[PDB]
Structure formats: structure tokens, C-alpha cells
Amino acid sequence: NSRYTHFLTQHYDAKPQGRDDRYCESIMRRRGLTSPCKDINTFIHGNKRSIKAICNPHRENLRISKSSFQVTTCKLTTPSPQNISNCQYRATAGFRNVVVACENGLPVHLDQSIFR
């Protein structure tokens, strides 16, 4: 499903290096979440099977996972004058239960609000 694979593109990174500001700068860029800059974005780590397991037709049910996941949240921050155009991110990494919308047994959206 395209909603699900879009979810993976925006919110899944199996094995992250660093999980710091530098990590956020890199991954937001390569997942196409810059130009224009996305305001906040959280990545869930670990294996893909465990995320799918949190969850017809275009109806979505909101679910919080029963176990926690390693996550890294990238939040848009105050740009430096030397590259005001570029997207500057602050990373917040943690072990959190995640809230997703499930459609047909697959996660298709992440509730970004709880990581704000």
C-alpha cells in the first residue's frame, strides 16, 4: 500500500547512527523532508515487523503501541545566518510508545503532536 510505504519513508529508520542534530540534518534531507523544510518529524527505529504489528478501506483507527520504541524526533530550529535558507534541526531521542493511524493492518500516519 502506498500510504504505508509513504509512512516508512517519512517515519522509519531501522538502524540510526548518532540520533543527534547531525543525524537529523542528514536524514531529513535524504527522505525529501527539506526544501521546503518540514516542521517536525519523528523516526521510529528497530525492525519493520514490530511496527506493522501495532496495527479497510480508507478508514483509520488511532492506536497507541503497547510497547515502547526507540525514536528520534527532528524539530525545525532557528536557522543560522550563514545558511538561513537551509533547514536546521534539533534532535530529541527517546524510548516512547507511538501513536499511529492504522489502515487495513498497516500504519499510515504518525501522530506527530505527542513528540512536540
Curated annotation (Swiss-Prot):
TRNA binds at residues 19-20, 74, 98. Keywords: Amyotrophic lateral sclerosis, Angiogenesis, Cytoplasm, Developmental protein, Differentiation, Disease variant, Disulfide bond, DNA-binding, Endonuclease, Hydrolase, Neurodegeneration, Nuclease, Nucleus, Protein synthesis inhibitor, Pyrrolidone carboxylic acid, Secreted, Signal, Stress response. Changing residue 111 to N/H/S/A: Strongly increased ribonuclease activity. Its main location: secreted. Disulfide bonds join 24-74, 37-87, 55-102. The keyword Transcription does not apply. One of its GO terms (biological process) is negative regulation of translation in response to stress. Has weak tRNA ribonuclease activity by itself due to partial autoinhibition by its C-terminus (residues 140-147), which folds into a short alpha-helix that partially occludes the substrate-binding site. In absence of stress, the ribonuclease activity is inhibited by RNH1 in the cytoplasm. In response to stress, dissociates from RNH1 in the cytoplasm and associates with cytoplasmic ribosomes with vacant A-sites: ribosomes directly activate the tRNA ribonuclease activity of ANG by refolding the C-terminal alpha-helix. Changing residue 33 to P: Homodimerization is similar to wild-type; causes mislocalization in the cytoplasm; strongly reduces ribonucleolytic activity. Changing residue 90 to Q: Found in a patient with Parkinson disease; uncertain significance. Its EC number is 3.1.27.-. Changing residue 109 to R: In ALS9; uncertain significance. A motif (Nucleolar localization signal) lies at residues 29-33. Changing residue 112 to A/G: Strongly increased ribonuclease activity. One of its GO terms (molecular function) is signaling receptor binding. The keyword Cytoplasm applies. It is an enzyme of class 3 (hydrolase). Changing residue 3 to A: Affects substrate preference. Significantly decreases binding affinity for RNH1. Changing residue 10 to A: Slightly decreases binding affinity for RNH1. The active site is at 11 (proton acceptor), 109 (proton donor). GO terms for cellular component: actin cytoskeleton; angiogenin-PRI complex; basement membrane; chromosome; cytoplasm; cytoplasmic stress granule; cytosol; endocytic vesicle. It is linked to Amyotrophic lateral sclerosis 9: A neurodegenerative disorder affecting upper motor neurons in the brain and lower motor neurons in the brain stem and spinal cord, resulting in fatal paralysis. Sensory abnormalities are absent. The pathologic hallmarks of the disease include pallor of the corticospinal tract due to loss of motor neurons, presence of ubiquitin-positive inclusions within surviving motor neurons, and deposition of pathologic aggregates. The etiology of amyotrophic lateral sclerosis is likely to be multifactorial, involving both genetic and environmental factors. Belongs to the pancreatic ribonuclease family. Secreted ribonuclease that can either promote or restrict cell proliferation of target cells, depending on the context. Endocytosed in target cells via its receptor PLXNB2 and translocates to the cytoplasm or nucleus. Under stress conditions, localizes to the cytoplasm and promotes the assembly of stress granules (SGs): specifically cleaves a subset of tRNAs within anticodon loops to produce tRNA-derived stress-induced fragments (tiRNAs), resulting in translation repression and inhibition of cell proliferation. tiRNas also prevent formation of apoptosome, thereby promoting cell survival. Homodimer. Interacts with RNH1; inhibiting ANG ribonuclease activity. Interacts with PCNA. This is Angiogenin. It comes from Homo sapiens (Human). The lineage of its organism: Eukaryota, Metazoa, Chordata, Craniata, Vertebrata. The gene is ANG.
